[PDB]
From a paper:
The prenylated flavin (prFMN)-dependent ferulic acid decarboxylases (Fdc) catalyse reversible non-oxidative (de)carboxylation of a range of acrylic acids with extended conjugation. The final step in the pathway consists of the decarboxylation of 3-methylcrotonic acid, catalysed by an evolved ferulic acid decarboxylase (Fdc) enzyme. Recently, a reversible 1,3-dipolar cycloaddition mechanism was conclusively shown to underpin catalysis in Aspergillus niger Fdc (AnFdc).
To further understand how the architecture of the active site affects the decarboxylation of 3-methylcrotonic acid, corresponding key mutations from TaFdcV were introduced in AnFdc. Overlay of the AnFdc wild-type and TaFdcV crystal structures reveals a downward shift of the Y404 residue in TaFdcV in the secondary shell compared to the corresponding Y394 in AnFdc. The Y394 residue is unaffected in the AnFdcI variant compared to wild-type. In contrast, the active site of the AnFdcII variant matches that of TaFdcV in the conformation of Y394 and M395. While binding of crotonic acid in AnFdc wild-type cannot be detected by the UV–Vis spectra over 2-h incubation, both mutants AnFdcI and AnFdcII readily bind the inhibitor, evident from UV–Vis spectra, demonstrating increased selectivity towards smaller substrates. Additional mutations in AnFdcII and TaFdcII led to a substantial further increase of 18 and 81 fold, respectively, in isobutene production. Surprisingly, the in vitro titer obtained with TaFdcII was slightly higher than the corresponding TaFdcV levels obtained. Thus, the 4 point mutations in TaFdcII (F404Y, T405M, V445P, Q448W) and 3 point mutations in AnFdcII (T395M, R435P, P438W), that create an active site architecture identical to TaFdcV, appear largely responsible for the increased isobutene activity compared to wild-type TaFdc and AnFdc.
Author numbering:
A (entry chain A): 4 to 507
B (entry chain B): 5 to 499
Write the structure that this text describes.
Amino acid sequence: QPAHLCFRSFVEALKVDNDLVEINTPIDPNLEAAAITRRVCETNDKAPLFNNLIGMKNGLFRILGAPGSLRKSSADRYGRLARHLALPPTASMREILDKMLSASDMPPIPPTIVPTGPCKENSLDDSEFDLTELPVPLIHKSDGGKYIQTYGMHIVQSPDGTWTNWSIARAMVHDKNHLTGLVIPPQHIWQIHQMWKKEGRSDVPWALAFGVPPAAIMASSMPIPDGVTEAGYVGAMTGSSLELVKCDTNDLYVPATSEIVLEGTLSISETGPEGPFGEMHGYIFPGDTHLGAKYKVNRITYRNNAIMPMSSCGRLTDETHTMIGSLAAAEIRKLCQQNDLPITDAFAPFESQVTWVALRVDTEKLRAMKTTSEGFRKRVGDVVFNHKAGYMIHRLVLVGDDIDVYEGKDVLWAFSTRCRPGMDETLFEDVPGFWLIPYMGHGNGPAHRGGKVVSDALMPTEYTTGRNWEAADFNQSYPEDLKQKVLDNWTKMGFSNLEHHHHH
Amino acid sequence: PAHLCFRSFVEALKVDNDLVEINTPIDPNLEAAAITRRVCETNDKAPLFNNLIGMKNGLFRILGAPGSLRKSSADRYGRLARHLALPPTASMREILDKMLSASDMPPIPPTIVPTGPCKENSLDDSEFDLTELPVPLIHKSDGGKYIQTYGMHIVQSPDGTWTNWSIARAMVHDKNHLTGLVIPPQHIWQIHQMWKKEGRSDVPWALAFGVPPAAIMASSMPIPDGVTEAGYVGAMTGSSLELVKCDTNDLYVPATSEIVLEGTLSISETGPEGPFGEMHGYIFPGDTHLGAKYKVNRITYRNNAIMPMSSCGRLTDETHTMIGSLAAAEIRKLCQQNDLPITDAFAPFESQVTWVALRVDTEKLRAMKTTSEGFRKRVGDVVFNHKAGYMIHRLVLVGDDIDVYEGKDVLWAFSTRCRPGMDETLFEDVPGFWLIPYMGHGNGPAHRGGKVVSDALMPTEYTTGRNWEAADFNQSYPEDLKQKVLDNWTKMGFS
Ligand SMILES: Cc1cc2c3c(c1C)C(C)(C)C[C@@H](O)N3c1c(nc(O)[nH]c1=O)N2C[C@H](O)[C@H](O)[C@H](O)COP(=O)(O)O
Ligand SMILES: Cc1cc2c3c(c1C)C(C)(C)C[C@@H](O)N3c1c(nc(O)[nH]c1=O)N2C[C@H](O)[C@H](O)[C@H](O)COP(=O)(O)O
Ligand SMILES: [K+]
Ligand SMILES: [K+]
Ligand SMILES: [K+]
Ligand SMILES: [K+]
Ligand SMILES: [K+]
Ligand SMILES: [Mn+2]
Ligand SMILES: [Mn+2]
């Protein structure tokens, strides 16, 4: 099976890339597995595979940490993401995001039902499992529970059957056969939960699949449009129909090679304590438990020697930064272009902790619109901040054609030197705000409203006649023949060059 | 020793394996600057150009990147440390503490010596032509050959009670003139104005290149109005600086200066100046203005004289390491003298030295029983109405958990703890720095406003204390488990 279509092959691909460390000695799921994974994420080291978890029983379970985190080397920085998508390990973020957007204007490819798969190799009914006895990790010391669900895919269907959504939302063990987790607007798991709640007849049929086809977990993290079944979008992106098997206890379909599957119901009535949790912005607030949605587990099915993927999320750099920010920025790029805004590129700089998106403007098309910064800022803000894809982003930085928005240092340079504080920004107080950012939910203002800004790092001539500066850098302040002579004599003179394929 | 003599400083860079000697012919027209620019962009070894095309009777060799960064994290600031008699592993906290140390010490006045190495050679008006010397063209669109990027201007108040040492750019105008920036609120401009109001004579002036490294650090620091830099450097180094009188005026220059120009700064004349590739990383090729005009009457120089050169622009060069860091040092001291609970200040390099992050002693903040709106306003009023705050447009207030010397920690705090609009106070009625592109080439007044105080303190920091832990390796795992993970790291297969 290809690495992008089967988590078990993905684990083998990381091993062949020399991008895996197999830890075969006993590791405690109480903090130790997550501490090692956290250190990996903070240093961009190899992904840890914990083959010997204290408490593993009857093949449940091994843990792969850091499945979507960065590699140390600059050349294959994004190689773990590339391996989710059948891209070369050297793929740029522009190439990864173009791949994730490619299904946007293609016919969906419906999944194929198969009679069985590896995910049916072992099963436990409700009398045979206890979620409190599995080696579920405690990820951060102050977490309000053991977060089993950090990199699995929730599967829920609209009541009329026309929309099946795949998405990542966190969940923790509540008791032997229940989870609690975040089911929040405007997320699709929440939109579908509300349809079931308004019908008022039944709890939501639900499955949670861990170790799904890597291309599916990428779509699970991406805010593709309302009403669009992720499975058909992934089929189109990969050029292949995904193989799905029916759940034993409900009529939902799960990827045939899923490592671990939970089958059950998401309650339309019951809640339970959820959180706190060490989250994407780099914080945990220990005194901070709230009521979350409650999931009932009726059955567990799993592969022989099942592997549970785990995100030890927090400060830079993990799955919450590489996948949440980047895939939101991709969808924002597409939204801008569909609203006839001259945006070529979007990226959420890691330095912003997933809270900014930098929009690269085609200034030739900006010049033809004959507008001003005040008018253009309002127009961009009103599109992005009134769409689901803009929900988690609080600052948009508009930059011209000379800025590579995939390079955080170039975005911070442009922001610091081209955006006059106050005058070149528009504040948005009457838009949905993201409560999870500390300055929102733990801040001086409304938790769920405003706190957003459009910052124009376009210089005045970019709107009229064109760029009227040169960078004071090696590339732009010296002629081509001189630069080539300096590069050709660099090591000869006794300076050193960073080797593209080796340097960190 | 290195901190008292530029020639010994070059020798120290050699011992540190932090110098590349280039003995093949190098063109001062862009090539020396292009090599220096690439050094600064990659944190490579400082280039010493021993063989410039057009060198004339020992004028001159060039040292590039004298105050730029080293590649290794262990000795990142070692080229700065070597200006100040600190170890090459010195932290930015230790460098800035050294630079502030002389603030509450008695000045040590300089010692006058009859002669020194800077007198080894001399050229009167008939003997030199500035247009025939190997002065660098530093960027292809510069409006002139900028001879002056790392020399010290020396001017004195009319009443003789204040002698100022400072860096300001100057370019060759003709055989015996320079043009340069003399701009408020800078001390060269303050002293210029004193002579203008007197109305009687041009300003006696000297420009010394390759001065005692400790003096070029004080030359780039905004020490208070009226304070003679020589006496400040004396107190900081615990020694009296050795100065020699100029041949053609009564100003005193460091005895070991590589190259000295003696003459006058005109109170009446101007000439075209710029454009120049500048500290924010831009040049606007359409952009010549009338600048101050200097007349050179005499050149004295060492045998085998070395001209230091800043090839300034995008990160990282002397304009970032020295201008931002030394301004941030003075702002820290200014805050403490105004009874503000600031422990540390630094201008993150990511901000292109437009931001300063102020680390707050939050125990002292809680005892003040204040709010964000009040505290931001007090901090901005102090810093943005002072010369030391002139070049800084954004102040970021952070609590005790943030290392302000780490740009990644400042950017994290800024991005996660400061709500846009609500947690910020804009300042429009304060002097603004025209050289930042968004000011002089922007949508608003070039010399006014565009400043902000961004409060990245969380609400409980003002009241009861921090109510979070970072979701990081340091804070979300117990000490015994962190130690076990670090002890077993290489044994498990990690690097
Ligand atoms: C990759 C990734 C994404 C998410 C999460 C995580 C990872 C690793 C956690 C580690 C579990 C932390 C948590 O913040 N988490 C998370 C979350 N969205 C939520 O509503 N709730 C969550 O608890 N997203 C983002 C969502 O997956 C995307 O916003 C996606 O677009 C949703 O799909 P849809 O609603 O658009 O179908
Ligand atoms: C280290 C350094 C400092 C400065 C400069 C450079 C270097 C390398 C140039 C490469 C020449 C570029 C130019 O931007 N430049 C420069 C300048 N200040 C000016 O008014 N004008 C200038 O043209 N400063 C900053 C000043 O040296 C400090 O602000 C100092 O505090 C002033 O001294 P004082 O007036 O406080 O005595
Ligand atoms: K999704
Ligand atoms: K602007
Ligand atoms: K000075
Ligand atoms: K106050
Ligand atoms: K704040
Ligand atoms: Mn969806
Ligand atoms: Mn001064």
